[PDB]
């Protein structure tokens, strides 16, 4: 991809040669690996037009195997342009461009002629929509009266999609394909600013309602193949739908609801994870809109954690929680404010909400049943100690709950190290060193701003226990452990 930025022609020339060889030759070959290089080469709007024209000329004469490879490769190329050049995609609909429309239309017919059987239709339908998207006005005419031949073949295909998309037809394969194709149409729409308010927005609204019932029906789990559900597919739909209508999502509650199966929860958390990490377009909605569900998110953590620990000490049901729990932990690592909003505050007879969160993360570090999770729990607790994230624990008094809870964590973890030897002992110590660094800074600024800084009994009763664990590590056999322990003084 990096190489293709400058010397496009050199790479592009190689592809053109292979097409000609296959075009003239009549002995079908399976060395299409050269053809499949389009999926990685950087493409721009002007360059993309070249690809369509060249393949169009030679498409009809290619062999069956070659035709499939170019179709798949061309599909993945389209997204590269949109992602790498978001602005150019918007301008396509902002101002008409006949040249872009012309090449797509010719290719559309060639692909349509190629696919006759139901099995063929499944492979090519995802591509056809992208081509249809490229030509804006052909969509408008399809909605209105249909031209004799110009907009006749297109209109027949578009309505054929809905039948399989709605399950009317007795064809599972087309039903599966219709989902894939429809999602991509929704995904592409997200980039459209909607200021044009073209038919694209209207077209999606027609199919969105039907799509959700197929993918978000708790009674019937949509099972594309061997896996119980196509987890990846649902994620794209939910993320896209959110961006279209972020104000009041209607399925967030359905997925977030406890009665729904775990897989619905798994899709929900991952979706919230992408929003935080991958937001290219500014005018998209942000995670802030979801803060209102923070209270409900925490409740899920408690149930998942409680059942996860019990299993370690059904077969796949237990394993499901561990995977779900791992995803939940990573979510807090991405953004801690999501779960810390609307603090419960310490009850007269019950503990608050910020405390129960820390205790759950702490009880995973010395586990050794789930080493992969434990590694993350260390990182998670190390992010809630940054000066920025200390405040959110209890905004009423940020310099009283910190020492009450943070110190109590040290007392629990330190007592574990001294109690007996563990396999990961040499690793917990390196993490414990940075915790001390990250609570000195909070005291330094706290003392500067206002000395007033408190020293409750736990601060003393836990300062002792810290020392009792740094002497006992000096005789530890591991050379790294003793060196690290000495530096902790």
mmCIF file of C-alpha atoms in Angstrom, residues 11 27 46 50-51 54 65 85 109 131-132 136 152 167 172 189 193 202 253 263 270 288 408 411 424 435 440 484:
data_model
loop_
_atom_site.group_PDB
_atom_site.id
_atom_site.type_symbol
_atom_site.label_atom_id
_atom_site.label_comp_id
_atom_site.label_asym_id
_atom_site.label_seq_id
_atom_site.Cartn_x
_atom_site.Cartn_y
_atom_site.Cartn_z
ATOM 1 C CA UNK A 11 2.149 -1.879 -10.294
ATOM 2 C CA UNK A 27 -7.196 -22.466 -21.239
ATOM 3 C CA UNK A 46 -9.074 9.564 -10.925
ATOM 4 C CA UNK A 50 -8.956 3.809 -14.950
ATOM 5 C CA UNK A 51 -9.527 0.447 -13.259
ATOM 6 C CA UNK A 54 -9.714 -1.395 -18.381
ATOM 7 C CA UNK A 65 -12.594 -18.090 -12.176
ATOM 8 C CA UNK A 85 -10.222 10.131 0.465
ATOM 9 C CA UNK A 109 -24.634 -4.407 -17.299
ATOM 10 C CA UNK A 131 -22.024 0.753 -8.627
ATOM 11 C CA UNK A 132 -25.659 1.803 -8.238
ATOM 12 C CA UNK A 136 -27.039 9.139 -8.077
ATOM 13 C CA UNK A 152 -35.302 -1.216 -16.405
ATOM 14 C CA UNK A 167 -37.639 -13.345 3.730
ATOM 15 C CA UNK A 172 -31.721 -18.779 2.433
ATOM 16 C CA UNK A 189 -24.649 6.334 3.560
ATOM 17 C CA UNK A 193 -23.315 14.682 5.028
ATOM 18 C CA UNK A 202 -34.663 7.909 1.909
ATOM 19 C CA UNK A 253 -32.174 -1.040 24.982
ATOM 20 C CA UNK A 263 -24.099 -12.525 22.152
ATOM 21 C CA UNK A 270 -17.610 -4.000 20.815
ATOM 22 C CA UNK A 288 -21.094 11.295 24.981
ATOM 23 C CA UNK A 408 -7.343 -0.129 50.426
ATOM 24 C CA UNK A 411 -3.580 -3.419 51.421
ATOM 25 C CA UNK A 424 3.189 -14.083 38.123
ATOM 26 C CA UNK A 435 1.057 2.735 40.976
ATOM 27 C CA UNK A 440 2.812 10.621 44.485
ATOM 28 C CA UNK A 484 12.930 -4.137 40.794
#
